[PDB]
Amino acid sequence: EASRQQRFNTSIRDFEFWLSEAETLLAMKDQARDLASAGNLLKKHQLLEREMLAREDALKDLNTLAEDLLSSGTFNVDQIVKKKDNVNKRFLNVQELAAAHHEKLKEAYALFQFFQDLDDEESWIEEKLIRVSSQDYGRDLQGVQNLLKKHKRLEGELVAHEPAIQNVLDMAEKLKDKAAVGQEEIQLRLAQFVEHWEKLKELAKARGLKLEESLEYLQFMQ
């Protein structure tokens, strides 16, 4: 049952609160300090993106209501004008900045995920370098057959990692722009990561060939 003036005031208060929340989110652009915090901010940006067109539509009706109040001889003309124009200016500012801020946060989340993937894959290569660093090629036929069964399991666990390793080298190319990746400590880690990956591949290939040569030898020498 509210009057036009009461509905206008309630709508303005509702928009002011929504705008203040969106302005706070835009002011949190540089608070993405880890994956979880970037993720929290991305969820807020997804809600803002989803609500934008509905708020734009509601603002059109709020503007129509304000103009209806102004044309009907209301007492608080200046108060209505200031409330309406302030909400419209603040909405345009949110609308014009939101997508850029959202994109910067998607880049921050991607950078944090890249650093987690680099850490993980460095450890994975290091563990495989221990596994492959064997000079046991078998002393008898059953022995070399056991070693070849294990070496094929290593080659099976390995072949499927080329894309996980390439995802680190590609995401380093996609995020080659940002400073944190360009830092000399990260550029060294990426060169060493490639050095250890190729060394792991050089060792696995070489060991497999030695194991096949050993099986052939031990089959004649049994």
Q: Please check whether residue 72 is in contact with residue 80, taking contact to mean a CB–CB distance below 8 angstroms.
A: no
Residue 177 has which token pair? 């722009």
- Report the alpha-carbon distance of residue 179 to residue 194 in Å, rounded: 21
| Distance (Å) of CA 38 to CA 25, 42, 103, 158, 216 | 12, 6, 12, 32, 56
**Please, what's the b/e burial string for 177-200 (b: 16 or more CB within 10 A of its CB; e: otherwise)?**
eeeebeeeebeebeeebeebbeeb
DSSP-assigned letter for residue 84: H
Q: How far is it, in rounded angstroms, from Cα 214 to Cα 137?
A: 6
Q: What is the CATH number of domain 7-110?
A: 1.20.58.60
DSSP string, 158-203: HHTTHHHHHHHHHHHHHTSSSHHHHSHHHHHHHHHHHHHHHHHHHH
Of 62, 89, 87, nearest to 70 by C-alpha is 62
CA dist 105 and 102 (Å) reads 5
Q: How far apart are CA 88 and CA 29, in angstroms?
A: 23
Place of tokens 């009907």: 72
Helix (H), strand (E) at residue 31: none
Sign of torsion over alpha carbons 189, 176, 118, 185 = positive
CB 114 within 8 A of CB 89: no
Query: Residues 125-148, buried b or exposed e (16+ Cβ, 10 A)?
Result: beebeebbeeeebbeeeeebeebb
Q: How far is CA 214 from CA 134, 152, 178, 211, in A?
A: 14, 15, 50, 5
Method: X-ray
CB neighbourhood size of 35 (10 A): 15
CA 39, 48, 176, 170 torsion-angle sign: positive
